[PDB]
Design a protein around this nucleic acid. Structure first.
Lengths: 351, 253, 253, 254
DNA sequence: TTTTTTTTTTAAAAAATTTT
DNA sequence: AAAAAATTTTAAAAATTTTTTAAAAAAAAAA
DNA sequence: TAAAATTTTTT
């Protein structure tokens, strides 16, 4: 997404990054950028390098990982919606081309990594060879069609539809480890929503209302700042990172005024630069209608769950049955009121 | 900051109460007294704490200074003291460490303890002084007994109040619990007097894990001031007899 | 059906006795009294609990009705009762629940309870009552002590009985442990009333896990009526004072 | 051939409750002059000196010098059988590899004969030479128990920066710091609650505190702990039984 | 008459190994 | 001389059993 | 897709 937005927010607005615990969400409908979680769950599930290869020869690690994550979401009261990526644009496809040549360079390193015979190098480069296919995406869509967790497909990008879902007020927050949902427009983001280490790892809750009230910015100047911090569609100018882009936004307040009133020799503009197209992609993306599909949550039927995850991948029975049972017991309970609904915030001492 | 305590078992019972619900909070220590007002980790319950200057043996506080205290660490340090122990909470200018001594009353064991602490960011909710409709007083051990018995059946209590009766209903896979409490007319004591200020009948549902966390404060007093009204969170007020109160807030289900 | 007690500790100790050993059993509540003839979940021991209607202060069971109750669940609802309560059982013929009213003796905390029943069919017709060789009446906490520390030695007690006293012999990997009691008449003293009425000596082995499960019943009575014969299952009778009796049967090796 | 009748069997119950946690196996060096126990612990850090003399027991006689191998968790499980007022009759034989125990209640007519399974093990003798220690602290036993059990929550190490006016137990850890200072109490007129301080030079030694937590399970034996240490010699934690002997633990500093 | 330890029976972490 | 960078490298997991400590909590024995 | 480490310039 952005190389260093979260460091800039932690250096500028420490009150904007909330550290709310994973136990804090009951009525919060949560938008999950799904394919980021599928990549993350295809990294770490490994038996020395080989992931969960069953008798047929196709990986199932993201299925079981996203399964046990989803039981941890309903068992903690978090109400997730999983939104998958769509057709990426051409400005993104330049970044996918550089990721593809990075993966090819990882394969060229993998040649003498497997010629040397080191197990750690071949599992590290096999972690770098992780790429989702259409059938893995369809397996995850079918899996969320089993437990009734709702599924949405954006035409362009899931981060944009997650941010517009927060913008429409249908869900509470988007939850993803990239910072593009603040660029796409979400007032609240939940970075590092992981299913373990609740004491060790708090959720970095990014409030964009606090970001705009601390920077003195509107949304569009934050879009030009996120352009200047090196997004996937537009590069930096020349050596401009956090502080110089903060200095240019705080003086000029427009990317057009930045590209005119900078020096042609000091920080020169790169050739074939398309900041207007990335700005229009951030403000107005191709987003599906949030009112067209509802956000339902129904009780699943156990027989189809057993027939899928013990029939076509041949895994365990007692752990899956106990996870479905505690999912059902966590879902059938009544809702719990949050105390900040009844009492308004008068501020924070912050020691 | 220097706050000598006439007996330190009170604040030891405060830390035994707070160790099970709060891990991280700040102490709003001013010249008017020691305050704490922080939320849950699960963001369901708020703990308002108040200890005025009138209960300490001495109290000096130049600035309204707040430190971010690990409540498990301060609970382990307050476990070091006795029950007739005299505690001075000491924090000097730019106190990175909160200092405590536990002066034993025979002047034989003076135990200095400095506690390293971190910077925090805890949201403080602005609460009003609402005229509560149904204010229920009861014994504290009775209320802890009621919550601990009803937590065996199910996770939810249904606290219903009649014009003269308090109905702690609960249900689950074990069955249906129903603990009814009348109003005293012949007892007329201080500890054991179930008295209800009566405005309008209420019927609210609360979780029982948070009420079990609330009833770890039961050796502080013999008074649970259950103040509640319709769609308004429940006040559980352990009134310490000389030093403020310990108000537990609980948003209903 | 309405069985009202006056000592709630009796029924609470019966459910704490039968909680660990039996999971589900049929409380065959007859017109004469509340009866429970059960067989072990490990299918080794046998429990015949009898609670006659003289100890119940109000008994109104007109219909001979029996229901299957989870003993762990009903022991949890009896754990919701206090140490001394007034337990009023209640049930209806059409309704498949067993209501419990624990009226506290301050006449304020009237705690109604209800409980779902899990009915089953258990054969209550094979009962082992015949003449026994030796009967040993000896105090209950002493028998709990002997079974508890012979469980430390091994998992086999060899009870050898004679006229001069009873001998509890145990062996294991740790060593050999022989606890030899002696017959004391002990007039006007029930703390050490170890009376043995022996006719035929016997030497046979048991399993001390089921003896530990039997000796978790010991806060009911102050005495244990031990009884055994030659290749006959041993009887541990817990004689409740004019209220009933709890008999534990154990088939040996 | 070996006979040791003791009327106060709670002393042996407290001794095996003290030594059950850090000793897995030990040799019970039984001589005619009393009962000794030469044992270095399972992790090979701390050395334990248990001495029960001949005048502490009521009926005590030995034929030869006995050193039998005892699993002390087994002896703890067989000394959990006894009562507090229960008398204890030790017994052993020559050709039998079995240590016998007889528990008798005085006010009752109950006898509980217990036998033990022994094993063959290498006998260790580490005779610590005695000297006048530079730091002799005679403090209440429950206060030392309180100090070890509440300094355990801070850090794994403790420093004792003692002085002639009083002893100062100090520890540092990731939770914080703690400094327990005990004044030398003279106006108690009890000689059990008084922290008697006898020195010639103040010292300060870093000690392992999990080992002091394992040491302080001997607190029902005595109301006084005789803390004896010096600059390099290990700390002596002496538990003075009032008529039988002493139980000394030795702790090498960090 | 509620505590102090004591003992007890669950529960917190904290790891290597799996969940095929 | 700090500040502010742009290169290079690293990393992405959930959970039952099992294994040790911390810890409530009724149940021992206390003042 | 993220964070930090180490060397590199800008001022």
């Amino acid at each position: 997404g952005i190389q260093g937005l979260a460091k800039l927010i932690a250096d500028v607005a420490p009150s904007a990054i909330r550290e709310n615990d994973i136990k804090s969400y009951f009525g919060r409908k949560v938008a999950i950028d799904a394919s980021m979680s599928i990549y993350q769950f295809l990294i770490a599930v490994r038996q020395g390098g080989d992931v969960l290869q069953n008798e047929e020869g196709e990986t199932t690690s993201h299925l079981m990982g996203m399964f046990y994550r989803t039981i941890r979401m309903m068992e903690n009261g978090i109400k997730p919606v999983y939104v998958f990526d769509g057709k990426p644009p051409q400005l993104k496809s330049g970044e996918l081309a550089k990721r593809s040549e990075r993966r090819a360079e990882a394969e060229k390193q993998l040649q003498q990594a497997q010629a040397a015979g080191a197990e750690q190098e071949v599992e590290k480069f096999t972690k770098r060879l992780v790429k989702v296919t259409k059938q893995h995406n369809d397996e995850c869509k079918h899996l969320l069609s089993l437990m009734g967790i709702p599924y949405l497909d954006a035409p362009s990008e899931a981060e944009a539809s997650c941010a517009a879902l927060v913008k429409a007020g249908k869900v509470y927050a988007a939850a993803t480890e990239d910072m593009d949902c603040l660029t796409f427009g979400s007032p609240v983001l939940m970075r590092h929503l992981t299913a373990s280490e609740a004491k060790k790892l708090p959720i970095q809750e990014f409030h964009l209302s606090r970001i705009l009230q601390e920077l003195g910015l509107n949304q569009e100047q934050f879009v030009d700042l996120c352009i200047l911090l090196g997004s996937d569609y537009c590069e930096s100018i020349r050596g401009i990172g956090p502080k110089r882009a903060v200095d240019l936004i705080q003086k000029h307040k427009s990317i057009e005024e930045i590209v005119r009133r900078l020096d042609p020799n000091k920080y020169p503009v790169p050739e074939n630069w398309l900041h207007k197209e990335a700005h229009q992609l951030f403000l107005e993306p191709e987003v599906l209608d949030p009112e067209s599909v509802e956000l339902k949550w129904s009780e699943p039927n156990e027989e189809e769950l057993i027939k899928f995850m013990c029939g076509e991948k041949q895994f365990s029975e007692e752990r899956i049955r106990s996870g479905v049972k505690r999912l059902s017991k966590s879902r059938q309970g009544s809702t719990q009121g949050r105390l900040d609904d009844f009492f308004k915030v008068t501020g924070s001492l912050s020691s | 900051f220097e706050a000598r305590l006439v007996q330190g078992s009170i604040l030891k019972k405060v830390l035994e109460a707070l160790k099970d619900l709060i891990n991280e909070a700040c102490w709003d220590i001013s010249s008017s007294g020691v305050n704490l007002q922080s939320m849950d980790s699960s963001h369901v319950s708020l703990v308002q704490l108040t200890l005025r200057s009138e209960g300490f043996d001495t109290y000096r506080c130049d600035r309204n200074l707040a430190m971010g205290v690990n409540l498990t660490s301060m609970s382990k340090i307050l476990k070091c003291a006795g029950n007739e122990d005299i505690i001075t909470l000491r924090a000097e200018d730019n106190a990175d460490t909160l200092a405590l001594v536990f002066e034993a009353p025979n002047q034989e064991k003076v135990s200095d303890y400095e506690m390293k602490l971190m910077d925090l960011d805890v949201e403080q909710l602005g609460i009003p002084e609402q005229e509560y409709s149904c204010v229920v007083k009861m014994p504290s051990g009775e209320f802890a007994r009621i919550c601990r018995d009803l937590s065996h059946i199910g996770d939810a209590v249904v606290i219903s109040c009649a014009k003269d009766g308090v109905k702690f209903s609960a249900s689950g896979e074990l069955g249906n619990g129903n603990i009814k409490l009348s109003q005293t007319s012949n007892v007329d004591k201080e500890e054991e007097a179930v008295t209800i200020e009566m405005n309008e009948p209420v019927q609210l549902t609360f979780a029982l894990r948070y009420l079990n966390f609330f009833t770890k404060a039961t050796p502080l007093s013999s008074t649970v001031t259950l103040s509640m009204s319709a769609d308004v969170p429940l006040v559980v007020e352990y009134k310490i007899a000389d030093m403020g109160h310990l108000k537990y807030y609980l948003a209903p289900k």
